[PDB]
Amino acid sequence: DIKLFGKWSTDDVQINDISLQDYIAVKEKYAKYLPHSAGRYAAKRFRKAQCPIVERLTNSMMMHGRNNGKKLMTVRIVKHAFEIIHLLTGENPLQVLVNAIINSGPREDSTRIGRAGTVRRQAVDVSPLRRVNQAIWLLCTGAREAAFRNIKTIAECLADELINAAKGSSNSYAIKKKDELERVAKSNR
Amino acid sequence: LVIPEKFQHILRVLNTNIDGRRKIAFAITAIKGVGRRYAHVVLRKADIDLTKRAGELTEDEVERVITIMQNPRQYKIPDWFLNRQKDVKDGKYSQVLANGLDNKLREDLERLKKIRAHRGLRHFWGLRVRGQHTKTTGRRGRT
């Protein structure tokens, strides 16, 4: 059997939306043991649609300068974050990644129109892959800004921001920036 | 874990005010003439444990650490651990602390000012003495 980080179970999780069912990974096959597969998903267009979602959260956690090249910092941090999550909510920690992706992603977003220096935005709507990507961005950035100096472990602070991104609370930096995007979308229309 | 009843929140050593809720070596470091390194030497010499916060120490440990730091060469504090190795006038090995450090600075300025040398002219006009390139940098603090 295939068990994530040795203690989890991937095949029992669920997806409630049709748009994010075709993109978000780790359901049927793609489920692996460890996040780092060192594969090439940027090789061709939408070939990064199929890589494991946990690896996807993993790749984006190196995103600031000193942490850049070090990938393992993440498969460390993503390790303790899941094991924290299961203690709080008490559900499959890979259900919490699904719900945070689904809720944190924008829906409608604004595209800047005008001349440089004058921002006048018009509302368009997000593509599924773009939804996933922006969502995960928001998750990692929310975790960083929240964890800079509170002296929180990023394990603790990402479990925080993830569970909060899943529940729908305004605690998550993620849900915040989403809510701003949708609201500007409302402003314009 | 512990709950010390007698704890000195403000400490006084060698004319200076020491913060003891800090760790021990890094509280001793606060005074002039001591870094983390020489602090580890003196506190490994006095037998004082490094696990204690600086406020749990009895007066005997503070007085034996003081006694260790006033008299360097008696306690087998290595000759290369001393701040001023051979001083210009007496020719002696001495570990220089706050007021003595500041004073030795003032004096080694005055000597070079009376002598009429280049180190001292440099130190006089407010220039960096090491021959640094003063074209580009060496600005801040100036009008």
Partner: protein, 72 residues
């Protein structure tokens, strides 16, 4: 605002560490140090004592990041 935390424990705070923390679900040294206004080393060594007492389950330990769960 400037932050004061307890370097060594107080009786008041000790009642909180002793009687409360075992009910907390997820326990992290930063979580304990945030709600009890304890300092880092003292809270860390506090959980090191709550290890020896047997009141707390240790899930995993990596370098500076530790994970603790309430007993049953």
């Amino acid at each position: 605002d400037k932050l004061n935390n307890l370097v060594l424990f107080d009786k008041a705070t000790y009642d909180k560490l002793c009687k409360e923390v075992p009910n907390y679900k997820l326990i992290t040294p930063a979580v304990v140090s945030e709600r009890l206004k304890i300092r880092g080393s003292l809270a860390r060594a506090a959980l090191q004592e709550l290890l020896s007492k047997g009141l707390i389950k240790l899930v995993s330990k990596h370098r500076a990041q530790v994970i603790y769960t309430r007993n049953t």
